[PDB]
Amino acid sequence: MAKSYPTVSAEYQDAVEKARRKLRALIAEKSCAPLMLRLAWHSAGTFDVSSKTGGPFGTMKNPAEQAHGANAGLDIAVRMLEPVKEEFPILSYADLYQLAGVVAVEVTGGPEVPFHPGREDKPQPPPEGRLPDATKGSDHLRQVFGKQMGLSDQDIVALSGGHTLGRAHKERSGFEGPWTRNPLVFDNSYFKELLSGDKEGLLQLPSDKALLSDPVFRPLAEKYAADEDAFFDDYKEAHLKLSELGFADA
Ligand code: HEM
Ligand code: NA
């Protein structure tokens, strides 16, 4: 609910901007924005507010966190981004993975998520099992996002909009296919596909369905389905809170 951002060195700021450009060109070229967003998201979602452990602090680099079940396939993102670290080694992995999320969203047409650099790489990855269970429901979402992460009900619907990008893969999570007809375009189509019900060739996890069966989550999804500026605004807000969990507080 309050931040005090470090002023990083001119050289770090220059690294960040150089990296941002390189991420644009890497991402746009290899069309892997969605997996990049997933890396940022999974790097940050592990934060627990009561224990002040986990969160966007580079730990996704430790091949132990890449071995967490929930994280199958992030090792591809981590290897894809290493050249970027090779050229700007002063950057932390913490910063580099969140900047990739931000750049993913912006390249695919989505809102401008501000970026405040300065995350340190911590040494101890969080414990496995903090991220949300795709087969679970509305109250689980509040346990993960709400009680552990400290985000709000609005953050949950808006953020669940990240599934406007990309798809599931059988070898990673078990589920298969995309949520939307245009998986390389950041728009509000995800909430439109939800409210439309199940259909062939499009995925819907039970955690997706949870948003339609809840009096708070339901109208938010309706709003975002109808109003893409509303969605882009709230998403921008939530993505930014997500990207700084435990970072630069007070
Ligand atoms: C309850 C919350 C969530 C659940 C249960 C969940 C679960 C999943 C699952 C099972 C996949 C498919 C993985 C695979 O086999 O490739 C996936 C993909 C993805 N998730 Fe979520 N996720 C959640 C929240 C989020 C959030 C908050 C974001 C971003 C802000 C996000 C971004 C993505 C993206 C971009 C992909 C596509 C990856 C690709 O195309 O390779 N997810 N998610
Ligand atoms: Na889309």
Automatic annotation (TrEMBL):
<keyword id="KW-0630">Potassium</keyword>
<dbReference type="InterPro" id="IPR019794">
    <property type="entry name" value="Peroxidases_AS"/>
</dbReference>
<feature type="binding site">
    <location>
        <position position="173"/>
    </location>
    <ligand>
        <name>heme b 2</name>
    </ligand>
</feature>
<dbReference type="InterPro" id="IPR002207">
    <property type="entry name" value="Peroxidase_I"/>
</dbReference>
<dbReference type="Pfam" id="PF00141">
    <property type="entry name" value="peroxidase"/>
</dbReference>
<feature type="binding site">
    <location>
        <position position="163"/>
    </location>
    <ligand>
        <name>heme b 1</name>
    </ligand>
</feature>
<keyword id="KW-0408">Iron</keyword>
<dbReference type="GO" id="GO:0016688">
    <property type="term" value="F:L-ascorbate peroxidase activity"/>
</dbReference>
<keyword id="KW-0575">Peroxidase</keyword>
<feature type="binding site">
    <location>
        <position position="169"/>
    </location>
    <ligand>
        <name>heme b 1</name>
    </ligand>
</feature>
<feature type="binding site">
    <location>
        <position position="167"/>
    </location>
    <ligand>
        <name>heme b 2</name>
    </ligand>
</feature>
<keyword id="KW-0106">Calcium</keyword>
<feature type="binding site">
    <location>
        <position position="163"/>
    </location>
    <ligand>
        <name>heme b 2</name>
    </ligand>
</feature>
<feature type="domain" description="Plant heme peroxidase family profile">
    <location>
        <begin position="74"/>
        <end position="250"/>
    </location>
</feature>
<protein>
    <recommendedName>
        <fullName>L-ascorbate peroxidase</fullName>
        <ecNumber>1.11.1.11</ecNumber>
    </recommendedName>
</protein>
<dbReference type="InterPro" id="IPR044831">
    <property type="entry name" value="Ccp1-like"/>
</dbReference>
<feature type="binding site">
    <location>
        <position position="167"/>
    </location>
    <ligand>
        <name>heme b 1</name>
    </ligand>
</feature>
<dbReference type="GO" id="GO:0000302">
    <property type="term" value="P:response to reactive oxygen species"/>
</dbReference>
<feature type="binding site">
    <location>
        <position position="35"/>
    </location>
    <ligand>
        <name>L-ascorbate</name>
    </ligand>
</feature>
<feature type="binding site">
    <location>
        <position position="30"/>
    </location>
    <ligand>
        <name>L-ascorbate</name>
    </ligand>
</feature>
<feature type="binding site">
    <location>
        <position position="172"/>
    </location>
    <ligand>
        <name>L-ascorbate</name>
    </ligand>
</feature>
<dbReference type="GO" id="GO:0009507">
    <property type="term" value="C:chloroplast"/>
</dbReference>
<dbReference type="InterPro" id="IPR019793">
    <property type="entry name" value="Peroxidases_heam-ligand_BS"/>
</dbReference>
<feature type="binding site">
    <location>
        <position position="173"/>
    </location>
    <ligand>
        <name>heme b 1</name>
    </ligand>
</feature>
<feature type="region of interest" description="Disordered">
    <location>
        <begin position="112"/>
        <end position="137"/>
    </location>
</feature>
<dbReference type="InterPro" id="IPR010255">
    <property type="entry name" value="Haem_peroxidase_sf"/>
</dbReference>
<keyword id="KW-0560">Oxidoreductase</keyword>
<keyword id="KW-0479">Metal-binding</keyword>
<dbReference type="GO" id="GO:0042744">
    <property type="term" value="P:hydrogen peroxide catabolic process"/>
</dbReference>
<dbReference type="GO" id="GO:0020037">
    <property type="term" value="F:heme binding"/>
</dbReference>
<dbReference type="GO" id="GO:0046872">
    <property type="term" value="F:metal ion binding"/>
</dbReference>
<keyword id="KW-0349">Heme</keyword>
<dbReference type="InterPro" id="IPR002016">
    <property type="entry name" value="Haem_peroxidase"/>
</dbReference>
<keyword id="KW-0376">Hydrogen peroxide</keyword>
<feature type="binding site">
    <location>
        <position position="169"/>
    </location>
    <ligand>
        <name>heme b 2</name>
    </ligand>
</feature>
<comment type="similarity">
    <text>Belongs to the peroxidase family. Ascorbate peroxidase subfamily.</text>
</comment>
<dbReference type="GO" id="GO:0034599">
    <property type="term" value="P:cellular response to oxidative stress"/>
</dbReference>
